[PDB]
Write a protein that binds this ligand. Structure first.
Ligand SMILES: Nc1nc2c(ncn2[C@@H]2O[C@H](COP(=O)(O)OP(=O)(O)OP(=O)(O)O)[C@@H](O)[C@H]2O)c(=O)[nH]1
Ligand SMILES: [Mg+2]
Lengths: 181, 380
């Protein structure tokens, strides 16, 4: 048994806790989860190797940043969840999320997760974002984030469809088990 | 339910950037569909059907320009409004997004993986499909793979004619507001309902491929003249909510055997003068070259009139049109083609009167195996 502190970071209303509750507890949170932060534990396998995950559901608020930055130490992989429905969450990942996780953990591997890849094609999300003057995060856009901020991989998840959830966290683990070059 | 058109094509100029080519109307992007009546309230399925015909060049293909302003197919948008013609959905608020379907240009994802046994051949139909078939397909289906690619409309039904609405509810509709009438006649004809809306519906047109193995890129560009080959401006109204044009342009079905248009244009001329005029057509091969786009002549040309020479205006219904070729000095001379046959029906009656009275009647084969179709609706 080998544990990885995978502090899942990411904005509010973008899908950290949705991805986690779909992962650790296997449920899609109906409403925006009021998050301070949590501790979970599951049993997952990574490319044929089973691993232990002691996980952290940190807050996306600007308020309890001191507590979330207390969570960043001991972290071995940073899961940054930003809404594809809200690419301003992608911009926040570019400005604060990745920079703060790196200021608290330099060179500690970071997974990049595009939450709600199922909405890149859903009419409501596209129409809302076009009315907001932005487009849902294309895999090239998240991949540009990943190359720019040295994310080990840019994944996408849809907690509504349970898409990529276990895949997201196995990749988070193998960001550490197999360090990316 | 009647498989046919109802209201005239409300016409919006749209910009190159997915934007209103006329931004001044961005608030007044409005149409009021007239004449709605008992059958109209009980018409089982009526749908406001929007299309975009991409003005500019032939294709968004990098390497070649095209003569700017080339009306090219780009798809259809449809929803039935029978619920709302019942009046149920009653809000000025409801800005209905309209999921638009571009005719199926699916050549991006299905091509990257076909390996280890290639035995498949096909043509290019991403727009070449008949607009009849696109129409009926969007009729039967119930989803659009638009992915946001659609347009927003706020809709309601208002009782009263142009007047009553424009008085009790002119807040929605000013005198600069665009108007589209349901194409036809009412259940109540007031003596003096003086209209002149001649909706010319382009149903299709057959054209043989010719010398070039590409079916010559038909652009029926028809000009309305007097009885002396004098073109007149605005005579062909392309669509509702916008003023007419001197000469009308057809969608250049890119190398298509039997293009199907479904287009409609209003005609409205001085009702006393319209009697003694005519029209002429041009069928050019529109190749991918600008200089060749202009230098190519209308390999086929055609010309039609307004009244039957007895004085009766051309009757409603479908009236076929031959694509005539060769010497168009025969067919562009102020009056000489008016002496000449110009459409199917008058040609076969000329051949019949030759059969009974053979007076030097040898039809020219330039009246060749290309033709054209128009159905006339005349709300004068
Ligand atoms: N449709 C859809 N919505 C999602 C998905 N994931 C998250 N959401 C939405 O995001 C909202 C908030 O969930 P999270 O993204 O987990 O919130 P968070 O990232 O944990 O941020 P905090 O809880 O504030 O710390 C939910 O109410 C969902 O509506 C998804 O995969 N699909
Ligand atoms: Mg959270």
């Amino acid at each position: 048994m080998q544990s990885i502190k995978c502090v899942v970071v990411g904005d509010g209303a973008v899908g950290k806790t949705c991805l986690l509750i779909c992962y650790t507890t296997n449920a899609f949170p109906k409403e925006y989860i009021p998050t301070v932060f949590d501790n979970y534990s599951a049993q997952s396998a990574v490319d044929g190797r089973t691993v232990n995950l002691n996980l952290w559901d940190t807050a996306g608020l600007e308020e309890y940043d001191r507590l979330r930055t207390l969570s960043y130490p001991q972290t071995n992989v940073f899961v940054i969840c930003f809404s594809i429905a809200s690419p301003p969450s992608y911009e926040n990942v570019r400005h604060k999320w990745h920079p703060e996780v790196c200021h608290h953990c330099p060179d500690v591997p970071i997974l990049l997760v595009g939450t709600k890849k199922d909405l890149r094609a859903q009419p409501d999300t596209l129409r809302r974002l076009k009315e907001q003057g932005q487009a849902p995060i294309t895999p090239q856009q998240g991949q540009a984030l990943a190359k720019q901020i040295h994310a080990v991989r840019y994944l996408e998840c849809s907690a509504l469809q349970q898409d990529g959830v276990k895949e997201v966290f196995a990749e988070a683990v193998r960001a550490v088990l197999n360090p990316t070059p | 339910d009647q498989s046919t058109f109802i209201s005239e094509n409300y016409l919006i100029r749209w910009g190159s950037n997915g934007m209103p080519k006329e931004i001044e109307k961005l608030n007044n992007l409005q149409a009021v569909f007239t004449d709605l009546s008992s059958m109209d309230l009980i018409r089982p399925r009526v749908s406001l059907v929007c299309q975009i015909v991409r003005v500019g060049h032939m294709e968004l293909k990098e390497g070649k320009k095209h003569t700017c302003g080339l009306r090219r197919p780009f798809g259809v948008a449809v929803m039935d409004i029978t619920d709302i013609i019942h009046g149920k959905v009653d809000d000025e608020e409801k800005q209905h997004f309209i999921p638009f379907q571009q005719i199926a240009m699916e050549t991006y994802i299905r091509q990257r993986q076909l390996i280890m046994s290639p035995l498949i051949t096909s043509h290019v139909i991403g727009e070449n499909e008949p607009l009849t078939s696109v129409l009926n397909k969007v009729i039967a289906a119930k989803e659009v793979n638009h992915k946001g690619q659609g347009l927003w409309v706020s809709l309601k039904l208002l009782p009263g004619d142009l007047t009553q609405v424009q008085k009790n509810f002119s807040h929605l509709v000013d005198r600069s507001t665009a108007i589209a009438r349901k194409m036809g006649f009412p259940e109540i004809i007031l003596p003096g309902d003086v209209r002149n809306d001649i909706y010319v519906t382009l149903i299709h047109g057959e054209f043989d491929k010719g010398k070039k193995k590409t079916p010559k890129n038909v652009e029926v560009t028809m000009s309305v003249h007097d009885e002396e080959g004098k073109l007149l401006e605005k005579a062909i109204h392309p669509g509702a909510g916008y003023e007419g044009i001197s000469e009308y342009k057809s969608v250049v079905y890119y190398q298509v055997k039997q293009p199907c248009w479904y287009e409609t244009v209003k005609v409205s001329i001085a009702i006393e003068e319209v009697t003694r005029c005519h029209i002429r057509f041009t069928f050019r091969h529109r190749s991918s070259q600008e200089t060749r786009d202009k230098s190519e002549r209308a390999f086929g040309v055609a010309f039609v009139k307004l009244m039957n020479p007895d004085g009766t205006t051309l009757q409603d219904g479908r009236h076929d049109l031959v694509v005539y070729k060769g010497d168009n000095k025969k067919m562009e001379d102020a009056k000489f083609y008016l002496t000449l046959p110009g459409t199917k029906m008058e040609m076969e009656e000329k051949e019949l009167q030759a059969s009974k009275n053979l007076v030097t009647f040898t039809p020219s084969k330039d009246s060749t195996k290309d033709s054209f179709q128009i159905a006339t609706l005349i709300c004068s």
